Amino acid sequence: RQWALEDFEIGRPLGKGKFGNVYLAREKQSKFILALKVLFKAQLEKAGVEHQLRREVEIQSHLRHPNILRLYGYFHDATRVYLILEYAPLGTVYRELQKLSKFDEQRTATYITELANALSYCHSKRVIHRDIKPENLLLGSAGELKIADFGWSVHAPSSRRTTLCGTLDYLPPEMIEGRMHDEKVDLWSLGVLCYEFLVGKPPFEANTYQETYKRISRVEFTFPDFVTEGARDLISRLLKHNPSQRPMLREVLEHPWITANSSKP
Amino acid sequence: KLEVVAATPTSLLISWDAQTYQMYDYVSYYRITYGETGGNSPVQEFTVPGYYSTATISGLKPGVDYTITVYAEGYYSSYSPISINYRT
Ligand SMILES: Nc1ncnc2c1ncn2[C@@H]1O[C@H](COP(=O)(O)OP(=O)(O)CP(=O)(O)O)[C@@H](O)[C@H]1O
Ligand SMILES: [Mg+2]
């Protein structure tokens, strides 16, 4: 349907974004709580990012899965764009990791399972996220992971996939090396994530983006001794230089470390 | 503009990458239509999600003039059709 500001009661602010603010809000008809993200056109246009917003809306509106943040719809006015989003009451995984500094194996495995299901659902529609990282993960009321921020996502048949995008510590080697990419870039970024969850910092971290690029390109990283055998195996399978050697998400879901540590529904 | 990227005797790969939209006006889906230029059966149709920039039309009859038309359906708008004629 159509939407306008008049269809929502607005509550307190939930956070400060780069180009706006997110508010708690409630749809009058249904009385359904949700979040309403407000973006200022002036700030979007200044930063150059409207194309990312188009992409986010056009893709994410179509995605309906328990572990993907719903984008119910959008609308806009002379000054603002509004995104109507599912409310994630437990906040970002980024903030959870800041608090706890590292996650244990159960929490980690359970989140990797949720994220893999969601990316399975994306990849069947031939959609690739391309920006998996802790800031783009939110948490439902039962603590269940929700991937969001489809700004840098792409539908594979509709793109050439030769430009680099994403976030420094999470970028796959293929993009750094200038090659055509596919759904396997999500697989790489999943492995970086699993590592960062377990260790509390990403594997290719360095003082400049140059060193970080070199280190990714050469898959130069080591694990601390605390990381178990099974986690090490899973991550090492995800962080292969050669995209075609990375597992399918099915195989990630069936990995024995994942099986042994993931919580039951 | 609308373009035919590739054709077989029974199928066309079409592409509307060239078509541009108004700032902040986002596409929900495309209505894709095709039939035999002038001489009549019902023009056939289907829709794809707005994030598609190309699509395949299959099961066409060889040696036929088609007219292919695409309607970009915004969440808040309808863009006026772009179309193209092609002969299998
Ligand atoms: N759906 C939701 N439910 C609950 N809280 C949310 C939310 N979406 C965002 N938030 C909160 O609001 C903060 C700002 O979110 P926002 O998406 O505006 O961040 P941002 O602008 O930095 C990411 P982007 O660069 O993608 O616009 C988040 O860090 C989080 O605390
Ligand atoms: Mg975003």
mmCIF file of all heavy atoms in Angstrom, chain A residues 141-184:
data_model
loop_
_atom_site.group_PDB
_atom_site.id
_atom_site.type_symbol
_atom_site.label_atom_id
_atom_site.label_comp_id
_atom_site.label_asym_id
_atom_site.label_seq_id
_atom_site.Cartn_x
_atom_site.Cartn_y
_atom_site.Cartn_z
ATOM 1 N N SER A 141 13.099 -10.062 20.058
ATOM 2 C CA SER A 141 12.750 -10.097 21.484
ATOM 3 C C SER A 141 13.175 -11.399 22.144
ATOM 4 O O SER A 141 13.509 -11.413 23.290
ATOM 5 C CB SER A 141 11.237 -9.882 21.680
ATOM 6 O OG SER A 141 10.538 -11.057 21.314
ATOM 7 N N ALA A 142 13.176 -12.486 21.407
ATOM 8 C CA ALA A 142 13.785 -13.722 21.870
ATOM 9 C C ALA A 142 15.295 -13.789 21.602
ATOM 10 O O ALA A 142 15.848 -14.838 21.676
ATOM 11 C CB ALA A 142 13.057 -14.905 21.216
ATOM 12 N N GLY A 143 15.969 -12.684 21.287
ATOM 13 C CA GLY A 143 17.434 -12.686 21.042
ATOM 14 C C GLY A 143 17.906 -13.301 19.713
ATOM 15 O O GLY A 143 19.051 -13.702 19.573
ATOM 16 N N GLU A 144 17.027 -13.348 18.745
ATOM 17 C CA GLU A 144 17.268 -14.031 17.494
ATOM 18 C C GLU A 144 17.818 -13.032 16.476
ATOM 19 O O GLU A 144 17.379 -11.889 16.429
ATOM 20 C CB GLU A 144 15.994 -14.697 16.994
ATOM 21 C CG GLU A 144 14.883 -13.754 16.601
ATOM 22 C CD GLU A 144 13.881 -13.392 17.707
ATOM 23 O OE1 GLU A 144 14.242 -13.216 18.877
ATOM 24 O OE2 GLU A 144 12.697 -13.212 17.358
ATOM 25 N N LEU A 145 18.778 -13.445 15.658
ATOM 26 C CA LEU A 145 19.486 -12.497 14.818
ATOM 27 C C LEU A 145 18.616 -11.994 13.667
ATOM 28 O O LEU A 145 17.764 -12.730 13.138
ATOM 29 C CB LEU A 145 20.752 -13.173 14.308
ATOM 30 C CG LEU A 145 21.591 -12.496 13.229
ATOM 31 C CD1 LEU A 145 23.017 -13.017 13.334
ATOM 32 C CD2 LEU A 145 21.051 -12.818 11.848
ATOM 33 N N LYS A 146 18.826 -10.752 13.240
ATOM 34 C CA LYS A 146 18.066 -10.194 12.109
ATOM 35 C C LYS A 146 19.030 -9.433 11.222
ATOM 36 O O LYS A 146 19.522 -8.448 11.681
ATOM 37 C CB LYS A 146 17.000 -9.187 12.569
ATOM 38 C CG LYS A 146 15.951 -9.674 13.571
ATOM 39 C CD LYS A 146 14.730 -10.310 12.929
ATOM 40 C CE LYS A 146 13.806 -10.811 14.030
ATOM 41 N NZ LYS A 146 12.585 -11.478 13.502
ATOM 42 N N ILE A 147 19.290 -9.837 9.979
ATOM 43 C CA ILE A 147 20.219 -9.057 9.177
ATOM 44 C C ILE A 147 19.487 -7.900 8.561
ATOM 45 O O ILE A 147 18.376 -8.048 8.152
ATOM 46 C CB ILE A 147 21.012 -9.875 8.130
ATOM 47 C CG1 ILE A 147 21.908 -8.957 7.315
ATOM 48 C CG2 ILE A 147 20.121 -10.612 7.140
ATOM 49 C CD1 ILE A 147 23.138 -9.633 6.803
ATOM 50 N N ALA A 148 20.115 -6.748 8.491
ATOM 51 C CA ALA A 148 19.490 -5.547 7.925
ATOM 52 C C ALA A 148 20.482 -4.779 7.058
ATOM 53 O O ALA A 148 21.531 -5.286 6.735
ATOM 54 C CB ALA A 148 19.036 -4.661 9.072
ATOM 55 N N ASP A 149 20.140 -3.570 6.662
ATOM 56 C CA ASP A 149 21.043 -2.742 5.905
ATOM 57 C C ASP A 149 21.461 -3.351 4.602
ATOM 58 O O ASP A 149 22.622 -3.626 4.387
ATOM 59 C CB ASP A 149 22.272 -2.318 6.733
ATOM 60 C CG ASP A 149 21.877 -1.724 8.110
ATOM 61 O OD1 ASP A 149 21.155 -0.698 8.138
ATOM 62 O OD2 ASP A 149 22.235 -2.327 9.150
ATOM 63 N N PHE A 150 20.493 -3.458 3.705
ATOM 64 C CA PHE A 150 20.685 -3.945 2.343
ATOM 65 C C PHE A 150 21.114 -2.840 1.324
ATOM 66 O O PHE A 150 21.040 -3.028 0.120
ATOM 67 C CB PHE A 150 19.421 -4.703 1.897
ATOM 68 C CG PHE A 150 19.285 -6.075 2.518
ATOM 69 C CD1 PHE A 150 18.961 -6.226 3.855
ATOM 70 C CD2 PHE A 150 19.429 -7.209 1.757
ATOM 71 C CE1 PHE A 150 18.812 -7.488 4.442
ATOM 72 C CE2 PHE A 150 19.313 -8.465 2.326
ATOM 73 C CZ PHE A 150 19.006 -8.586 3.684
ATOM 74 N N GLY A 151 21.623 -1.724 1.816
ATOM 75 C CA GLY A 151 22.206 -0.663 0.983
ATOM 76 C C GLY A 151 23.198 -1.136 -0.069
ATOM 77 O O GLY A 151 23.211 -0.621 -1.161
ATOM 78 N N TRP A 152 24.037 -2.118 0.242
ATOM 79 C CA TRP A 152 25.074 -2.517 -0.674
ATOM 80 C C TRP A 152 24.738 -3.840 -1.311
ATOM 81 O O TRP A 152 25.559 -4.382 -2.021
ATOM 82 C CB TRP A 152 26.404 -2.584 0.062
ATOM 83 C CG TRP A 152 26.953 -1.245 0.453
ATOM 84 C CD1 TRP A 152 27.175 -0.760 1.732
ATOM 85 C CD2 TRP A 152 27.422 -0.246 -0.442
ATOM 86 N NE1 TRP A 152 27.718 0.518 1.670
ATOM 87 C CE2 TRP A 152 27.875 0.860 0.349
ATOM 88 C CE3 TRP A 152 27.477 -0.145 -1.841
ATOM 89 C CZ2 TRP A 152 28.363 2.029 -0.225
ATOM 90 C CZ3 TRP A 152 27.971 1.041 -2.412
ATOM 91 C CH2 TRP A 152 28.442 2.091 -1.599
ATOM 92 N N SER A 153 23.529 -4.347 -1.101
ATOM 93 C CA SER A 153 23.152 -5.620 -1.703
ATOM 94 C C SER A 153 22.915 -5.466 -3.222
ATOM 95 O O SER A 153 22.835 -4.357 -3.757
ATOM 96 C CB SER A 153 21.913 -6.205 -1.050
ATOM 97 O OG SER A 153 20.774 -5.415 -1.297
ATOM 98 N N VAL A 154 22.792 -6.595 -3.895
ATOM 99 C CA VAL A 154 22.720 -6.619 -5.356
ATOM 100 C C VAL A 154 21.945 -7.854 -5.761
ATOM 101 O O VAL A 154 22.021 -8.899 -5.084
ATOM 102 C CB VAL A 154 24.153 -6.599 -5.965
ATOM 103 C CG1 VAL A 154 24.858 -7.922 -5.715
ATOM 104 C CG2 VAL A 154 24.163 -6.267 -7.433
ATOM 105 N N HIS A 155 21.152 -7.725 -6.816
ATOM 106 C CA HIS A 155 20.547 -8.913 -7.475
ATOM 107 C C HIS A 155 21.531 -9.354 -8.545
ATOM 108 O O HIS A 155 21.853 -8.580 -9.440
ATOM 109 C CB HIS A 155 19.234 -8.516 -8.108
ATOM 110 C CG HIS A 155 18.553 -9.605 -8.888
ATOM 111 N ND1 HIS A 155 18.116 -9.413 -10.185
ATOM 112 C CD2 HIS A 155 18.165 -10.860 -8.536
ATOM 113 C CE1 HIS A 155 17.505 -10.513 -10.598
ATOM 114 N NE2 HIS A 155 17.513 -11.401 -9.615
ATOM 115 N N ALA A 156 22.029 -10.586 -8.438
ATOM 116 C CA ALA A 156 23.179 -11.032 -9.302
ATOM 117 C C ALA A 156 22.937 -10.959 -10.846
ATOM 118 O O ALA A 156 23.758 -10.363 -11.561
ATOM 119 C CB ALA A 156 23.719 -12.396 -8.853
ATOM 120 N N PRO A 157 21.786 -11.457 -11.345
ATOM 121 C CA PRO A 157 21.441 -11.336 -12.778
ATOM 122 C C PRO A 157 21.349 -9.911 -13.275
ATOM 123 O O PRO A 157 21.437 -9.703 -14.474
ATOM 124 C CB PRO A 157 20.062 -11.940 -12.872
ATOM 125 C CG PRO A 157 20.022 -12.925 -11.745
ATOM 126 C CD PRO A 157 20.765 -12.236 -10.636
ATOM 127 N N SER A 158 21.166 -8.940 -12.384
ATOM 128 C CA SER A 158 20.965 -7.585 -12.813
ATOM 129 C C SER A 158 22.234 -6.781 -12.629
ATOM 130 O O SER A 158 22.213 -5.565 -12.772
ATOM 131 C CB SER A 158 19.787 -6.964 -12.071
ATOM 132 O OG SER A 158 18.591 -7.725 -12.186
ATOM 133 N N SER A 159 23.360 -7.420 -12.389
ATOM 134 C CA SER A 159 24.579 -6.622 -12.202
ATOM 135 C C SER A 159 25.804 -7.345 -12.673
ATOM 136 O O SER A 159 25.844 -8.543 -12.647
ATOM 137 C CB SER A 159 24.746 -6.302 -10.718
ATOM 138 O OG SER A 159 26.087 -5.933 -10.406
ATOM 139 N N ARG A 160 26.821 -6.576 -13.040
ATOM 140 C CA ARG A 160 28.094 -7.102 -13.575
ATOM 141 C C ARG A 160 29.049 -7.599 -12.493
ATOM 142 O O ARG A 160 29.895 -8.473 -12.757
ATOM 143 C CB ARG A 160 28.793 -6.013 -14.405
ATOM 144 C CG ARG A 160 29.378 -4.852 -13.581
ATOM 145 C CD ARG A 160 29.903 -3.658 -14.411
ATOM 146 N NE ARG A 160 28.834 -2.921 -15.102
ATOM 147 C CZ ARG A 160 28.362 -3.193 -16.325
ATOM 148 N NH1 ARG A 160 28.847 -4.203 -17.059
ATOM 149 N NH2 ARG A 160 27.375 -2.447 -16.821
ATOM 150 N N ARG A 161 28.921 -6.988 -11.304
ATOM 151 C CA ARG A 161 29.614 -7.380 -10.066
ATOM 152 C C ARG A 161 31.131 -7.360 -10.167
ATOM 153 O O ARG A 161 31.840 -8.382 -9.885
ATOM 154 C CB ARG A 161 29.119 -8.745 -9.559
ATOM 155 C CG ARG A 161 27.742 -8.703 -8.908
ATOM 156 C CD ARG A 161 26.776 -9.568 -9.662
ATOM 157 N NE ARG A 161 27.389 -10.848 -9.813
ATOM 158 C CZ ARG A 161 27.152 -11.738 -10.752
ATOM 159 N NH1 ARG A 161 26.236 -11.583 -11.663
ATOM 160 N NH2 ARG A 161 27.838 -12.848 -10.704
ATOM 161 N N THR A 162 31.611 -6.189 -10.564
ATOM 162 C CA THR A 162 33.018 -5.922 -10.690
ATOM 163 C C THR A 162 33.484 -4.766 -9.843
ATOM 164 O O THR A 162 34.651 -4.510 -9.788
ATOM 165 C CB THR A 162 33.405 -5.672 -12.182
ATOM 166 O OG1 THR A 162 32.655 -4.562 -12.691
ATOM 167 C CG2 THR A 162 33.163 -6.947 -13.075
ATOM 168 N N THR A 163 32.593 -4.080 -9.153
ATOM 169 C CA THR A 163 32.973 -2.998 -8.262
ATOM 170 C C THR A 163 33.021 -3.502 -6.820
ATOM 171 O O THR A 163 32.212 -4.325 -6.394
ATOM 172 C CB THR A 163 31.936 -1.875 -8.354
ATOM 173 O OG1 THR A 163 31.615 -1.716 -9.728
ATOM 174 C CG2 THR A 163 32.437 -0.548 -7.766
ATOM 175 N N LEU A 164 33.971 -2.953 -6.090
ATOM 176 C CA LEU A 164 34.194 -3.269 -4.721
ATOM 177 C C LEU A 164 33.221 -2.453 -3.900
ATOM 178 O O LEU A 164 33.112 -1.227 -4.086
ATOM 179 C CB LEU A 164 35.637 -2.896 -4.326
ATOM 180 C CG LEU A 164 36.063 -3.139 -2.878
ATOM 181 C CD1 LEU A 164 37.536 -3.424 -2.742
ATOM 182 C CD2 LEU A 164 35.756 -1.948 -2.017
ATOM 183 N N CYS A 165 32.558 -3.146 -2.970
ATOM 184 C CA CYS A 165 31.805 -2.526 -1.900
ATOM 185 C C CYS A 165 31.746 -3.390 -0.616
ATOM 186 O O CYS A 165 32.035 -4.581 -0.573
ATOM 187 C CB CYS A 165 30.403 -2.221 -2.401
ATOM 188 S SG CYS A 165 29.493 -3.711 -2.830
ATOM 189 N N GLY A 166 31.341 -2.748 0.459
ATOM 190 C CA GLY A 166 31.281 -3.399 1.775
ATOM 191 C C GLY A 166 32.061 -2.590 2.745
ATOM 192 O O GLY A 166 32.192 -1.392 2.586
ATOM 193 N N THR A 167 32.649 -3.265 3.725
ATOM 194 C CA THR A 167 33.270 -2.592 4.849
ATOM 195 C C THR A 167 34.627 -3.242 5.049
ATOM 196 O O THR A 167 34.727 -4.466 5.050
ATOM 197 C CB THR A 167 32.384 -2.779 6.082
ATOM 198 O OG1 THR A 167 31.163 -2.068 5.879
ATOM 199 C CG2 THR A 167 33.088 -2.305 7.389
ATOM 200 N N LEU A 168 35.642 -2.404 5.255
ATOM 201 C CA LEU A 168 37.054 -2.774 5.197
ATOM 202 C C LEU A 168 37.468 -4.182 5.719
ATOM 203 O O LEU A 168 38.027 -5.005 4.983
ATOM 204 C CB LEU A 168 37.841 -1.700 5.937
ATOM 205 C CG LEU A 168 39.336 -2.015 6.041
ATOM 206 C CD1 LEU A 168 39.996 -2.181 4.668
ATOM 207 C CD2 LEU A 168 40.082 -0.990 6.859
ATOM 208 N N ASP A 169 37.188 -4.449 6.992
ATOM 209 C CA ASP A 169 37.650 -5.657 7.616
ATOM 210 C C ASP A 169 36.945 -6.890 7.148
ATOM 211 O O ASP A 169 37.415 -7.998 7.394
ATOM 212 C CB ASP A 169 37.506 -5.531 9.123
ATOM 213 C CG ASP A 169 38.583 -4.665 9.725
ATOM 214 O OD1 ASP A 169 39.741 -5.123 9.798
ATOM 215 O OD2 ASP A 169 38.273 -3.523 10.067
ATOM 216 N N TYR A 170 35.835 -6.685 6.458
ATOM 217 C CA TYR A 170 34.970 -7.755 5.956
ATOM 218 C C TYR A 170 35.042 -8.081 4.436
ATOM 219 O O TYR A 170 34.422 -9.097 3.954
ATOM 220 C CB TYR A 170 33.536 -7.347 6.346
ATOM 221 C CG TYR A 170 33.347 -7.633 7.778
ATOM 222 C CD1 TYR A 170 33.585 -6.667 8.787
ATOM 223 C CD2 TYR A 170 32.988 -8.915 8.154
ATOM 224 C CE1 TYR A 170 33.486 -7.024 10.133
ATOM 225 C CE2 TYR A 170 32.847 -9.249 9.478
ATOM 226 C CZ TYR A 170 33.121 -8.328 10.451
ATOM 227 O OH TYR A 170 32.921 -8.833 11.745
ATOM 228 N N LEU A 171 35.755 -7.230 3.701
ATOM 229 C CA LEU A 171 35.873 -7.362 2.244
ATOM 230 C C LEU A 171 36.574 -8.646 1.857
ATOM 231 O O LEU A 171 37.608 -8.972 2.434
ATOM 232 C CB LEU A 171 36.658 -6.208 1.647
ATOM 233 C CG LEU A 171 36.069 -4.822 1.806
ATOM 234 C CD1 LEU A 171 37.149 -3.760 1.533
ATOM 235 C CD2 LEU A 171 34.864 -4.662 0.907
ATOM 236 N N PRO A 172 35.995 -9.399 0.881
ATOM 237 C CA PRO A 172 36.653 -10.606 0.372
ATOM 238 C C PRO A 172 37.815 -10.304 -0.583
ATOM 239 O O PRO A 172 37.939 -9.166 -1.096
ATOM 240 C CB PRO A 172 35.518 -11.324 -0.353
ATOM 241 C CG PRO A 172 34.701 -10.204 -0.894
ATOM 242 C CD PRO A 172 34.706 -9.161 0.188
ATOM 243 N N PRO A 173 38.687 -11.298 -0.794
ATOM 244 C CA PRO A 173 39.882 -11.039 -1.605
ATOM 245 C C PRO A 173 39.514 -10.752 -3.038
ATOM 246 O O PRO A 173 40.027 -9.792 -3.627
ATOM 247 C CB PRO A 173 40.720 -12.328 -1.472
ATOM 248 C CG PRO A 173 39.828 -13.388 -0.878
ATOM 249 C CD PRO A 173 38.629 -12.682 -0.271
ATOM 250 N N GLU A 174 38.564 -11.506 -3.557
ATOM 251 C CA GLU A 174 38.130 -11.296 -4.931
ATOM 252 C C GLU A 174 37.843 -9.849 -5.299
ATOM 253 O O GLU A 174 38.148 -9.436 -6.433
ATOM 254 C CB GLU A 174 36.934 -12.165 -5.351
ATOM 255 C CG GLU A 174 35.671 -12.087 -4.519
ATOM 256 C CD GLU A 174 35.632 -13.234 -3.530
ATOM 257 O OE1 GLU A 174 36.690 -13.442 -2.879
ATOM 258 O OE2 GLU A 174 34.598 -13.942 -3.398
ATOM 259 N N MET A 175 37.269 -9.085 -4.372
ATOM 260 C CA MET A 175 36.870 -7.720 -4.686
ATOM 261 C C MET A 175 38.058 -6.849 -4.656
ATOM 262 O O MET A 175 38.098 -5.853 -5.367
ATOM 263 C CB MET A 175 35.872 -7.163 -3.663
ATOM 264 C CG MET A 175 34.403 -7.403 -3.943
ATOM 265 S SD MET A 175 33.352 -6.680 -2.633
ATOM 266 C CE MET A 175 31.746 -7.338 -3.031
ATOM 267 N N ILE A 176 39.000 -7.191 -3.781
ATOM 268 C CA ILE A 176 40.251 -6.434 -3.639
ATOM 269 C C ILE A 176 41.104 -6.642 -4.917
ATOM 270 O O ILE A 176 41.735 -5.733 -5.431
ATOM 271 C CB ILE A 176 41.089 -6.920 -2.422
ATOM 272 C CG1 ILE A 176 40.281 -6.899 -1.096
ATOM 273 C CG2 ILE A 176 42.375 -6.117 -2.274
ATOM 274 C CD1 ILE A 176 40.349 -5.651 -0.265
ATOM 275 N N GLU A 177 41.084 -7.866 -5.413
ATOM 276 C CA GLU A 177 41.866 -8.268 -6.546
ATOM 277 C C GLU A 177 41.164 -7.915 -7.827
ATOM 278 O O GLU A 177 41.687 -8.208 -8.888
ATOM 279 C CB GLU A 177 42.158 -9.759 -6.466
ATOM 280 C CG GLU A 177 42.958 -10.103 -5.213
ATOM 281 C CD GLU A 177 42.927 -11.579 -4.874
ATOM 282 O OE1 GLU A 177 42.226 -12.384 -5.560
ATOM 283 O OE2 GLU A 177 43.613 -11.938 -3.890
ATOM 284 N N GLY A 178 39.984 -7.291 -7.752
ATOM 285 C CA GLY A 178 39.371 -6.656 -8.927
ATOM 286 C C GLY A 178 38.507 -7.574 -9.760
ATOM 287 O O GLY A 178 37.936 -7.097 -10.705
ATOM 288 N N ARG A 179 38.359 -8.850 -9.381
ATOM 289 C CA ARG A 179 37.549 -9.828 -10.112
ATOM 290 C C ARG A 179 36.028 -9.796 -9.914
ATOM 291 O O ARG A 179 35.485 -9.294 -8.940
ATOM 292 C CB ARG A 179 37.942 -11.244 -9.741
ATOM 293 C CG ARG A 179 39.415 -11.572 -9.855
ATOM 294 C CD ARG A 179 39.760 -12.408 -8.650
ATOM 295 N NE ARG A 179 41.028 -13.094 -8.739
ATOM 296 C CZ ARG A 179 41.314 -14.216 -8.074
ATOM 297 N NH1 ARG A 179 40.405 -14.807 -7.262
ATOM 298 N NH2 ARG A 179 42.518 -14.768 -8.226
ATOM 299 N N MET A 180 35.358 -10.422 -10.860
ATOM 300 C CA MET A 180 33.951 -10.557 -10.820
ATOM 301 C C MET A 180 33.591 -11.471 -9.640
ATOM 302 O O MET A 180 34.123 -12.619 -9.496
ATOM 303 C CB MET A 180 33.451 -11.168 -12.123
ATOM 304 C CG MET A 180 31.939 -11.296 -12.227
ATOM 305 S SD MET A 180 31.477 -12.034 -13.796
ATOM 306 C CE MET A 180 29.755 -12.411 -13.472
ATOM 307 N N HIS A 181 32.648 -10.983 -8.833
ATOM 308 C CA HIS A 181 32.179 -11.728 -7.634
ATOM 309 C C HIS A 181 30.772 -12.294 -7.695
ATOM 310 O O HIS A 181 29.965 -11.918 -8.558
ATOM 311 C CB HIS A 181 32.327 -10.878 -6.387
ATOM 312 C CG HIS A 181 31.522 -9.626 -6.409
ATOM 313 N ND1 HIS A 181 32.077 -8.401 -6.695
ATOM 314 C CD2 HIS A 181 30.223 -9.396 -6.113
ATOM 315 C CE1 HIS A 181 31.144 -7.469 -6.604
ATOM 316 N NE2 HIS A 181 30.011 -8.051 -6.259
ATOM 317 N N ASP A 182 30.482 -13.184 -6.745
ATOM 318 C CA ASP A 182 29.180 -13.768 -6.681
ATOM 319 C C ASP A 182 28.744 -14.012 -5.208
ATOM 320 O O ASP A 182 29.338 -13.472 -4.268
ATOM 321 C CB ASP A 182 29.184 -15.016 -7.582
ATOM 322 C CG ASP A 182 30.059 -16.155 -7.019
ATOM 323 O OD1 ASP A 182 30.753 -15.986 -5.975
ATOM 324 O OD2 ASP A 182 30.062 -17.249 -7.627
ATOM 325 N N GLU A 183 27.722 -14.853 -5.022
ATOM 326 C CA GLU A 183 27.187 -15.103 -3.703
ATOM 327 C C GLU A 183 28.239 -15.554 -2.658
ATOM 328 O O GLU A 183 28.043 -15.366 -1.442
ATOM 329 C CB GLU A 183 25.924 -15.985 -3.756
ATOM 330 C CG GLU A 183 26.059 -17.503 -3.696
ATOM 331 C CD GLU A 183 26.808 -18.078 -4.880
ATOM 332 O OE1 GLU A 183 26.742 -17.425 -5.943
ATOM 333 O OE2 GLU A 183 27.478 -19.144 -4.730
ATOM 334 N N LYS A 184 29.391 -16.041 -3.123
ATOM 335 C CA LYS A 184 30.448 -16.524 -2.211
ATOM 336 C C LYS A 184 31.096 -15.420 -1.408
ATOM 337 O O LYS A 184 31.835 -15.711 -0.495
ATOM 338 C CB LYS A 184 31.571 -17.249 -2.986
ATOM 339 C CG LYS A 184 31.192 -18.548 -3.686
ATOM 340 C CD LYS A 184 30.782 -19.584 -2.683
ATOM 341 C CE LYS A 184 30.563 -20.929 -3.356
ATOM 342 N NZ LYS A 184 30.139 -21.982 -2.378
#
